[PDB]
């Protein structure tokens, strides 16, 4: 999270932390079911460890729950030129235990417009040339006219959200990928990608679009 503040610890009990190996790599995600994490497809990997209950990602706390992802549901449409369909589902090896510091973020039993504010949270870098944040950070961003992402490689306002005012620094950055964009407390987008120089807006996966692909998976599993 570039230009945010550290969260109130465990205030975001859905926040998943992903540890992916092929080397190692790290992403965000969020918990939608007791055995499912929602993330992005460019995080896929040989094997992945999932830490839940964390605030400081380097301090082992008792709220923590590390679980082995035993299935990977990469969206089949996922394409690496446009980074369309940057969404992936993960079946955890074990149903997590719902506490205070660890909780699911349910989806209602709606296409979202530019204008509103939103929030995303993550342990990603807090600046272009900085390290990933030890502690979970968050930031409030605005939904933009998709002509604001116009110069993004094949931006599609139906598959993607254009998140973050260009007149601010506040933005999601590297490592924050897979983390939920929560609009008024509802997940509406997953951090996908953005500029190398960290200039906003960044491209978020439009949740609404893939909600059936999702419904299908959780049902058949």
């Amino acid at each position: 999270i570039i230009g945010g503040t550290e969260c109130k610890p465990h205030s975001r009990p859905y926040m998943a932390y992903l540890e992916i190996v092929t080397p190692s790599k790290f992403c965000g995600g969020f918990l939608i079911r007791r055995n499912f994490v929602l993330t992005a497809a460019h995080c896929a990997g040989r094997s992945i460890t999932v830490t839940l209950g964390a605030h400081n990602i380097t301090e082992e706390e008792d709220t923590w729950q590390k679980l082995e992802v035993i299935k990977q549901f990469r969206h089949p449409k996922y394409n690496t030129s446009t980074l369309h369909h940057d969404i992936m589902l993960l079946k955890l090896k074990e149903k997590a235990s719902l506490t205070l510091a660890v909780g699911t973020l349910p989806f209602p039993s709606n296409f979202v417009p530019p204008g509103r504010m939103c929030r995303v949270a993550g342990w990603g870098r807090t600046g272009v040339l900085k390290p990933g944040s030890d502690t979970l950070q968050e930031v409030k961003l605005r939904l933009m006219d998709p002509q604001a992402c116009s110069h993004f490689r094949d931006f599609d306002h139906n598959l993607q959200l254009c998140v973050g005012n260009p007149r601010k620094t506040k933005s999601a950055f590297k490592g924050d990928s897979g983390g939920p964009l929560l609009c008024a407390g509802v997940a509406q987008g997953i951090v996908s990608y953005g500029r190398s120089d960290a200039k906003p807006p960044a491209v978020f996966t439009r949740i609404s679009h893939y909600r059936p692909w999702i419904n299908q998976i959780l049902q058949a599993n």
């Binding site: 990608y193 500029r195 960290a198």
Partner: protein, 57 residues
């Protein structure tokens, strides 16, 4: 295992920058797209790269 034939500064924070002569351990070449997931032998970094850009030894 792949090499670089030209210097390259990526646009997306999902992709690697690299120089001529840099070398790469590819990782996920399955997704449909110009780009493969690789690992810099030079920086140790993981990210996507252009497949018309690199060359195998």
């Amino acid at each position: 295992l792949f090499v670089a034939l030209y210097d390259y500064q990526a646009d997306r924070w999902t992709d690697l920058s690299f120089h001529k002569g840099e070398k790469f351990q590819i990782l996920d070449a399955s997704p449909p797209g110009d780009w493969w997931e690789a690992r810099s032998l030079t920086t140790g970094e993981t990210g996507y790269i252009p497949s018309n850009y690199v060359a195998p030894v």
